[model samples]
Target chain A: SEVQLVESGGGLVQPGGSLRLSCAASGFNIKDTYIHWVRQAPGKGLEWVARIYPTNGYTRYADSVKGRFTISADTSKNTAYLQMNSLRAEDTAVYYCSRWGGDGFYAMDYWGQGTLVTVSSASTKGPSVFPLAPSSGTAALGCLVKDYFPEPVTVSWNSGALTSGVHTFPAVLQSSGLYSLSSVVTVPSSSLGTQTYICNVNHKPSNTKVDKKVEP
Target chain B: DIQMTQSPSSLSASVGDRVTITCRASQDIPRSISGYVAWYQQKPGKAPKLLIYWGSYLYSGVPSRFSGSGSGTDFTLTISSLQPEDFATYYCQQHYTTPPTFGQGTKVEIKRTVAAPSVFIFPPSDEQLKSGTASVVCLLNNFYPREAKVQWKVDNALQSGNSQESVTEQDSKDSTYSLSSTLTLSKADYEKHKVYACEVTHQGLSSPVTKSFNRGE
Candidate 1:
């Protein structure tokens, strides 16, 4: 059997806003191990941020983020959380949570996929929408949102919430120092009649809304 | 934590070769509690997998050909008869003390005929470009010897950073190796540059193979 760690919950945050990242452990008992948080800044080397011993709720944090960064574990939930307050642009990095096999050893034997967080206060640009040709059995729609700061945006179809077949790709950083991303949604293809599909782009910071329509 | 030193930092072996790797600890390890030692196998682009636990007990699903022995700082992991899938790095971990320690990995590399990698560079996906950056991927397939290097260039200038490369991975079916690397650049830089190139250097090839993707394309 293998130990598994999955990291989630990190995204755009304002300079002064707060964010909490989580790591879930499986195939092992969380109460008996040490969970450590590590990070790598864009184009930079890896840094140890903090670590928590789940058994007793003991924690150790690095000097760099000593004040604002805090780590905790919930044995009841089998998850560890890394919470940061007063985030800053300099804090942008991919946060990873790892498991240190306890028994007097320093081996961090298991790791989670890193989660990205970007901190900025720049203007958020509304997303632009387009329609992709329908594939067999499904209608595809795409929304391209560029030059957005803060990294938070949502895409919907016909003003209804989407629960499945929705894909939001990772945000890409532009040379202009802004971020862009694409969200695609695939819906059941209508075989009988022409249906008009609307793509909605919502940017909270800019309070901008866009609607693009397509018929297939 | 007791320090661990592994011998034979690296070795070349082929299928059916009897491979042996050793781990020595700074102090005695307890024979009780399963010896507090373990052996792990790690492949490129993947996490280290537990093979032998409690010093000598094989982990679930581990091949019977794999065996571990020894106690108190000195340990040995032997492959009675190496299988094709056994060509990877092996590490020994001791957890009986405060801070667990692991030995420097012993790499079990392939010693066989060479096959040059086929190189290819794929342009950024539309979704990637829509996200304001060009994420180009370079793929090298069917290479041999597991010794290789990947380099990137923009407008003929050597490029670094903003790139992630994978470790060589063997194709389970064919036992050949393949890997990929990705380079990400800002849209402005991607559009401004004339060409982006990926160069692969391998012992199997007389000269490095280069593949390019144009900006306009």
Candidate 2:
């Protein structure tokens, strides 16, 4: 049978808010198939949010959204629902609902047109920087920017805005409904003399700016 | 919990050659226990299969050539006469602790004599001249194991610019690999009396192979 899934609901929400989206299925019996809620960030790839077994009304959520997320289904209405609480900037994404089941393997058979959700806030928190253990003739420093909103921030070094040697890891959604990430700056081994490395951060959402320094 | 380390992480051998790989545990495992240590064989792109168990006992259907020995912290896996199918990876695991640990895999690859590469240099082409630039090409062919270093020099000095290097491609006719590198320069540099050389350094040869080109026809 030709399966089609449609998703709806999603809009702008602030941090610590709740959200619920719906998925409707057609051309197939909703009771005989399992449903899944997946999402993709504006410029990122797909991520699973939750899965619900309509046969037994059992639901499981991804660890990243586990305690704050849930999934439910209504066989009579041929619809599945995704309920999430304590949203954050990292939670901003296009949510999609899909059906599961195929020949011999359980895969996403059909998908919905996705609904966009954006989480924003007016509050901001500056980041804290720390210097990691020194390697042989090298200086490695970490800048951890936590509890920030709007998701846009800039980090530069005193050596000029040369980002050639910086490594910025993915931002994480913390349990306290905030976001954090670790960005490290590494300079090559040249002189062990007193060289001070400075990390300057700018958070435009709240018009906040600060600097942290380390000497090696 | 204990740690496991493997030695001779990789080795090259041909059929009928005897091969051995060893594993060392951080602490002493029970000498009297049989299932404390196990050995597994894994083919490329496939899951691991049990080959030896109980330290030195062979698993069912395994060939006699495959054997394991030693107890406590030291262990060995030996192949009396290596076979074609035996040239793969092997692993040793310690099951004595609650969290079993496996040693880094030991890869046994087929050993073959290295074949020297033939370096050929070509003059600039007409299509290159039409583009307002001169392109000199270097081709290295018939190399085994597909590994070689290439460099371009003008008048014996390293010329560094937008020189393009090609990935190695296999010649299905003989199972050898071919590589190409092209150096593009202005028409003025190509017409100079200076000599341009392509140097290929490979393990098969005692010295690097150098091929030279010039505008002197």
Candidate 3:
């Protein structure tokens, strides 16, 4: 049987922030499948954003997707989501959701309808960065980072004294052309309050760093 | 649906020699949609690599010798100046729609034959139709080991054909073999709804299999 993909409704607008696009598939057992997000610009070739396996939900991102892009999938709903923060006019293009082969996750044989999102911030304040950790100390951390005209950004950990061991995660551009970056990091229990961890984001032209100090 | 057939089914070619594969659609699928066809190369155990997509748009980082041009129900995939690394079989696929069908491939082998003095045609399937209109090709399979050819004729005269008559040493699978000939006809010759034939010739093969089609017949 052939696979069919249904995308979330078209035309999403994020006045001053980020947007999320969703794609769902039918007619196949998705448990062993991997979902990928691809973007095609006008008159240009296609670009790969990221891929996520539905089973354990492991993800691999392209190097260019730093900062404002995030890809996630829901096994229960058989759906995949792409979120972009900090909207800009240049992010406009058709985005597709596809299922890839299992072995190397290469070659997308099934695809879904595309979604388009547009972003606009009347003011030039740029994007906002929320607190990465509430208090710190080996807690799982998750948050949305946004910006207008978003480029690639990194999310990493700076151990105890805020030294660099952090790695960068890829970002996704929503239909509205906004950028969104998200990540989940594990800080061992031994390094609790004794160390400081920070989520540093590298946006184009400017750098924004967010930190959380562990309380004793 | 018309059945498509290829000759020699396999062939060999050396470096710098010309290699060609041909395909004829089951029926005329409209020229406007011809651009939707594509070609791919697949090595053993690897994903099929897209060599040409949308009929003629070359994928990024592909060799220039890999070219495609044809329309409607007849098309061809050609590789000019074959290289040593070009030893793999080639296939053509129709990207026009889902459930895309492919043609059996032709394996080009290494062989020695004097380059014949001939007039090579671009999009060889573009010869004048008896009705004085152009025909568009649909699909050209890139799958190799089974050689195929697509040609054009006008007024009962063979204008251009995809024939590479030479043998090249290939991997242990099979030796590379190819076919060549002319499509002789003119637009006026088949005016009375006469059937036009697209033929194939090869080695170790008894006779050529020619498929013919006529408009409103």
TM-score of each: 0.51, 0.38, 0.31
**CAPRI grade of model 2:** incorrect
Comparing to the true complex, what docking class would candidate 3 get? incorrect
True contacts kept of 3: 0.00
Per model, how many backbone clashes are there?
9, 1, 80
Query: Which parts of model 3 are misplaced by more than 4 Å?
Result: A12-16, A120-216, B1-217
Off by over 4 Å in 2: A1-216, B12-15, B40-50, B53-64, B83-89, B107-111, B119-149, B154-157, B160-197, B202-217
| Residue pairs in clash, model 2 | B34-B54
Q: What class would a CAPRI assessor give candidate 1's docking?
A: incorrect
For model 1, residues B66-112, the per-residue Cα lDDT tens digits are 99988656889999887767767788877565444567779877655
Scored against the true structure, residue A186 in model 2 reaches a CA lDDT of 53
Which window of ten consecutive residues has the lowest lDDT sum in model 2 chain B? B167-176
- Native RMSD of candidate 1 (Å): 9.8
Q: Write the per-residue lDDT of candidate 2 for residues B1-217, one digit (tens) a residue.
A: 5777887877877667889899888886666644466776755323346677767878768899989888767888899997756756687877564234567778776555578876666655443456465656566656776678899988888877546555332332343455656676778767674798999999898999898866555
Best by DockQ: 1
Q: Residues A101-167, candidate 1, lDDT per residue (tens digit)?
A: 6765455666776777878776546544444323325445445455666655767776875545454
Question: What do the candidate models score in CA lDDT, each in turn?
Answer: 0.71, 0.67, 0.51
- What ranges in model 1 sit over 4 Å off? A1-5, A9-20, A25-71, A82-216, B28-34, B119-140, B146-173, B178-217
Query: CA shift at B126, candidate 1, in angstroms?
Result: 12
TM-score of chain B of 1: 0.66
Candidate 2: Cα lDDT at A105 = 23
lDDT of residue A151 for candidate 2 = 58
